[PDB]
Amino acid sequence: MASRILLNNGAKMPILGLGTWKSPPGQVTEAVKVAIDVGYRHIDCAHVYQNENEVGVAIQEKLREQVVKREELFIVSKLWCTYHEKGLVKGACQKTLSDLKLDYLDLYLIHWPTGFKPGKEFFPLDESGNVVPSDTNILDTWAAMEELVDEGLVKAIGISNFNHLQVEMILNKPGLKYKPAVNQIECHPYLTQEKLIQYCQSKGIVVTAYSPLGSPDRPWAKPEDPSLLEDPRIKAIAAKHNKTTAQVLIRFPMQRNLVVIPKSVTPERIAENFKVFDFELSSQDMTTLLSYNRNWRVCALLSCTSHKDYPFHEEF
Ligand SMILES: NC(=O)c1ccc[n+]([C@@H]2O[C@H](COP(=O)([O-])OP(=O)(O)OC[C@H]3O[C@@H](n4cnc5c(N)ncnc54)[C@H](OP(=O)(O)O)[C@@H]3O)[C@@H](O)[C@H]2O)c1
Ligand SMILES: Cc1nc2c(-c3ccc(Cl)cc3)nc3ccccc3c2c(=O)n1CC(=O)O
Known part of the structure; x- marks a missing residue:
């Protein structure tokens, strides 16, 4: 297993990165220090992660x-939904750069295809709890992202949570300047993404798997919800390799030619999660893990199901 994958800009992206959603400010500095010590060279960030x-x-x-x-x-960040207006994109990127204390990003993603009303609130709601959209569209936001590459703020641009038709929309844009390098999507044994992965890989777009451990710390999670880390069937595959369930869940997408970004703030787990280059899942293991698919999403953006650009009505 080579540890990096080639992007469309000639740069190489580490296949294992550290996720940072829900890493509290009071713990994430240590987590990132430990991760770098340990060997991580890719950090997945976002302005909305605060x-x-x-x-x-x-x-x-x-x-x-x-x-x-x-x-x-290899530092990744993402343009939040309240900054899709073409006139707001550069400022949002530069705020991320200033916060990160960097002069460029390796990769900058449109975080979600849905634009939200601009303003201070990240999830602006009306008096009845609906997300308030903005009058923005995918293609105009993409053109504003392209300008960031031309100005040297970011080395590559991509998308996240785009369905295949929304990806196609960018690919087919007349006067396209940069193709998206990456689509970052939820992916794990309960949401295996076979069709969207096949689509993206066939189009030369690298896929990053987010929530590979099933995001057990996500804020909505219902107790009756499926739990990957606790799945006794995956526990048995792990035991046979003398690995943890988490290590199996990280190795799984690696063997599908995906990038994967498990999150932890716990030093022992940060180290554990990186120790995934010394074993292989068998053909049968891969087939068994794939067979657990239920099309079950932990990040369904339910507040936005009525948005014109909601991504998850389409099959893929
Ligand atoms: N583009 C998007 O829309 C999007 C959406 C979701 C996620 N993401 C990205 O993907 C990253 C990963 O997804 P995620 O944060 O949703 O969840 P995840 O990585 O699937 O799971 C994180 C959880 O698993 C725990 N954990 C980590 N390693 C463990 C281990 N070895 N054993 C047991 N428990 C372990 C963590 O606990 P501790 O931290 O307490 O150790 C945390 O509660 C995010 O942080 C973010 O960077 C992007
Ligand atoms: C999927 C997701 N949901 C939330 C949510 C969220 C999650 C689930 C519900 Cl039902 C409503 C909101 N809230 C946040 C609050 C503050 C900072 C970040 C978030 C985020 C957040 O960052 N994400 C992750 C992401 O979009 O990458």
Whole structure:
């Protein structure tokens, strides 16, 4: 297993990265320091995660310590939904750069295809609890992302939570300047994404799997919900390899030619999650894990099911 995958800009992206959603500001600095110590070279960030300054502190410290140089790191962030207007994109990117204390990003994603009303609130609601959309569209936001590459703020651009028709919309845009390098989507044994992965890989778009452990810490989660880490069937596959369930869940997407971004703030788990280059899941293991698919999403963006650009009505 080579540890990096080639993108359409000639850069190589580490297949294992550290996720940072729900990593509290008061713990994520240490998590990122430990991750860098440990061997992680890819960090998945976002403005909406409300912790980019603290991620940036950690990166700065490890650069100052001479542990890594900037060129060896692969830093990803994402344009939040309240900044889809073409006139807001550059400022949103530069705010992320300032918080991260960086002068470029390796990859910048449109976080979701849905634009939300601009303003201070990340999830702006009306008096009846509906997300308030903005009058923005995918193609105009993409053109504004392209400008960030031309100006040297970001090395590559991509998308996240786009269905195949929304990807197609960008690919088919007259006067396209950059193709999306990556589509970052939820993917794990309960949502295996066979059709969208086949689509993206066939189009030369690298897929990153988010919530690979099933996001047990997500804020809506209902107790009766399926639980990957607790799945006794996956526990048995792990036991046969002398690995943990989490390690099996991380290795799984790696063997599908995906990038994967497990999140932890716990030092032992950060280290555990990186120790996935010393074993292989068998053909049968892969087939068995794939067979657990239920089309079950932990990040369904239910507040936005009426949005014109809601991505999950389509089959894929
Ligand atoms: N583009 C998008 O829309 C989007 C959406 C969702 C996620 N993401 C990205 O993907 C990342 C990963 O997804 P996620 O945060 O939803 O969830 P996840 O990585 O599937 O699961 C994270 C949870 O698993 C725990 N954990 C981690 N390693 C473990 C291990 N070895 N053993 C047991 N428990 C373990 C963590 O606990 P502790 O942290 O307490 O150790 C945390 O509660 C995010 O952080 C974010 O960077 C992107
Ligand atoms: C899927 C997702 N949901 C939320 C949610 C969220 C999740 C589930 C419900 Cl039902 C409503 C909102 N809230 C946040 C609050 C503050 C900071 C970040 C979030 C986020 C958030 O960052 N994500 C992750 C993402 O979009 O990457």
